[PDB]
Design a protein around this nucleic acid. Sequence first.
RNA 1: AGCAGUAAGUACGCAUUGAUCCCUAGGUCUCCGAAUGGGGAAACCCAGCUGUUACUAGCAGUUAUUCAUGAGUGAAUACAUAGCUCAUGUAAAGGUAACGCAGAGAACUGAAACAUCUAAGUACCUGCAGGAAGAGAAAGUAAAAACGAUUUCGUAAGUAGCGGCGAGCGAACGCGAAGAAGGGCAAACCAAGAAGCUUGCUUCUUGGGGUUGUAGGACUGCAACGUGGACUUAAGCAUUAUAGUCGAAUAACCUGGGAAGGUUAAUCAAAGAGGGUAAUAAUCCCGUAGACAAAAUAGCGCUUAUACCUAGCAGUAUCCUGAGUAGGGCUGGACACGCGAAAUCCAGUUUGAAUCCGGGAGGACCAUCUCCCAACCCUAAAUACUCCUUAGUGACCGAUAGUGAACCAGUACCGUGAGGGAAAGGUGAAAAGAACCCCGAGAGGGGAGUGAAAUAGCACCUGAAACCGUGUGCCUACAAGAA
RNA 2: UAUGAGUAGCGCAAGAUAAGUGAGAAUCUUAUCCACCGUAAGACUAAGGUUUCCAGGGGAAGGCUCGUCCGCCCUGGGUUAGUCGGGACCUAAGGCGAGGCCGAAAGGCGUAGUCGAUGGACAACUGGUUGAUAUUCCAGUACUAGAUAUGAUCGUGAUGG
Lengths: 99, 44, 88, 61, 67
Amino acid sequence: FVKTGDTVKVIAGKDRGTTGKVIKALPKVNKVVVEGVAIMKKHQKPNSENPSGAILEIEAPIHVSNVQVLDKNGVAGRVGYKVVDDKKVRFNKKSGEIL
Amino acid sequence: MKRTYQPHKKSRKTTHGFRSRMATKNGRRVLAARRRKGRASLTV
Amino acid sequence: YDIIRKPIITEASMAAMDQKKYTFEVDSRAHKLLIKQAVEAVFDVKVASVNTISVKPKSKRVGKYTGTKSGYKKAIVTLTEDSKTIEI
Amino acid sequence: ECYFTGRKTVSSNNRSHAMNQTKRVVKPNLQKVTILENGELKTVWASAKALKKLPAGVERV
Amino acid sequence: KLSETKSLLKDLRALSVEELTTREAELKKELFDLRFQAAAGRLENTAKLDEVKKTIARVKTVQAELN
RNA sequence: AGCAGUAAGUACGCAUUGAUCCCUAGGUCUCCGAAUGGGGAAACCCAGCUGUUACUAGCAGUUAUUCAUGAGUGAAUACAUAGCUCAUGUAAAGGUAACGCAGAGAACUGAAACAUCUAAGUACCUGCAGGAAGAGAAAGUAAAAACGAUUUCGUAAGUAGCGGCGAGCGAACGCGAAGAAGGGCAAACCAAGAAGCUUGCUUCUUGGGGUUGUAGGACUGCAACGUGGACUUAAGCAUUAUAGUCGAAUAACCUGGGAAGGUUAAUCAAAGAGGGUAAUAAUCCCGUAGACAAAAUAGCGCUUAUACCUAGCAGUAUCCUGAGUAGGGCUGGACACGCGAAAUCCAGUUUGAAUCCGGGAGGACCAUCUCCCAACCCUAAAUACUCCUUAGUGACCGAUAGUGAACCAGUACCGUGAGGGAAAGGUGAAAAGAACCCCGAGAGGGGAGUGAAAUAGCACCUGAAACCGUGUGCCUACAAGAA
RNA sequence: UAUGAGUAGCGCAAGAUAAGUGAGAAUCUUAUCCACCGUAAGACUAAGGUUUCCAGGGGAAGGCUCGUCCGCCCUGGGUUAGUCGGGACCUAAGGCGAGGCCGAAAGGCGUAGUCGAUGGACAACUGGUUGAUAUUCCAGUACUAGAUAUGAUCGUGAUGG
């Protein structure tokens, strides 16, 4: 997409309908780590930067298909973009149009 | 007994140096075969 | 002009310090008189001469293919006394 | 080899009695001559056909 | 942010090589004791190496090329 | 909108202010290498000159050769000449995918052997060229009215022919289609000059003259047509590569680790091509169809005067029209053509015309007739092939295949060399890669936990097959079997 | 993947004990004896090898067995010149060869010239020095050649001889 972002729905996949804030997408990964979503956990060794380890609630990224950006009234769809203003205006379809 | 190659540095060159191979309009041709194939090196 | 590469710190480097010598590096395309006067310029240290030696390249394996580590001309900076040593 | 005589020793092929499929080498006439001086002063080969047609136009050509 | 200021400011003006680039093709052209802190360690701060060589680089390839 | 190639892997950092990135142009461009100041084995050494700036430095450039063009020099020997010196011009040497052309050019074969033939003038090798090359404007074919440069394809048709007439090789004509452009010069003459100025010169230089077949030009008449053709110049126009941009149309339930699968419904429409998405999507995304966008970018094309040389025409004073040239002898070769009745063309060698009342061709050749005008030069187009640039297409192929090479392949490796020449992809969706605990020198294991799954644990999907096993019910330690 | 087959071989010479090392010692290390070679099985030096050297650490494979050891592996250092060998000198044998010669072509020959050492030219040698470099680092003595600083004086005297 364009930079996510906001709370973002997850329609299909392991966790249906879950919304969660994003800023950290890195679209070259083409699947987005979102807090709360795809709860990975790592049994890490008691080593540097965690001298106990065994628990890392870092979470997995899931595909662009299961990312769904909502406009600010919680309404997702398809991003019509660049349409309105100086450089670019993002919106979804059937949406409240905000970014 | 004695084997074939017990070469020295003059021995390992002076048949196969870049001007030796390049010289006679001929070895440079087969070097250009070795370029148009393009193996691991050229001159040796 | 300052085309000195780097110093070299061995355990013999402290013997060079006590000897008022150094172990400095430059580029290959060089001459010990030329880097001698360059050392004289940027350093104002009083040089006797420099020794000759360079180092062959070290082609071992570094990684999953052959580490073709390159050589460099280990310049033995032979000074005279009554000048400015550099302790870096 | 001679320049203004045209060609050279050019290859050919030999015949024989109930021909045995053989080869020849065609050689023209070979004469180093220095005929004229236009600013010439130049020794060069020639062929005898061009010798007999030196008086055709060959004093400068 | 930092780099567009601290790169674009410098020497697009047409003063000359032994004239303007005295700060770069003469002064900080002493790349000594920054390199020479390189591999001496005790530096902790990297980007100056190709940053400064980049600035003297653009100094030469623009300013010590345009004449 | 993050960047910080490969990829972990780190750090200072860096960045919607506009980064990273994409494109275009300019920059610098180590050394070698055509490689070239000189030598030299490839990654070298040693220089000279000119300024530089300082040093028994450094910087920056100049210094290979041949050719051509000048300039100077000036031996035997006076001029000269050779020769030498300097200057100018990448010219140009060189690298080359395939096609071409030209030279040089076999054998093996096959012919049931083989000396003729064939293979083929092919394999190779060398040179010369471009985007194509050659190719070409009748000194043609043909045989009656018969057309009118070439080129490619089909036809004629294995037809005519040739050939130890074996074995084979092999047309052309005419027709059909594409493509369809011809135009200069020397000559003759005329004018200028200079000169054999030995005067009237009869050679050179310049510009007209005109490029010819039913002859044509020069001499007497006498007409301005765009033209790659009678200027394939420059200026605008337009549009394409060269950055890309927008770009429609959906929700729930069941299942599962996960829906796009099943079920329920709805939409769209220049987009239900295709690919991802944990499991098969039109409506999730990339996209897709369409619709926009480029300054520089390499072009293509259109209009413009210009970028310049041509016409008809009647008559015929004489000249011209392509000399060692045609031809003739001999030796070759190609032409279907193997010397033959042998055409016809091109070679060597020898001899050698005529020249417009001319000359040539019409398969030996002699007459009549038909056609043409060589012996001077250029000619697009239709054609051949791709290393290449994408746009792509597949009753291509799926890791012994498909390129030798899906993988750091021409790799490893062999060989001194020329050369040869391998093997190998897949965990899981996502490393979420097994924290911890215990055994163990360690590895490795075992629990725990991980994940949908741990026979799923790093060469990891799936896992036969030979091999080795461990357990298992029966039988065999008086037996000499294709079991 | 068998098989043969746990068989051949274990690559020409003798070690021995104690102690250490470790977890594990025959084979690692030390001590102490023995033993062998010794016109060599010593040292030094060509070509060659191309870092194998040493230091530290480790033991996936390698070591023909083991293996803490190692020319194995990781990491890090280690080679120093006016005089040593070469080049900045000359040149044989030879090669290349502008000129030129001939040749289908490519070419092959070759005058000048050019490189080409195994040759001929020429200054440094004693002592110490590491884990390792020593004629190279330095103490002492030099000498060679040049430089700029400085009373010459006509002097140098060639590719010629």
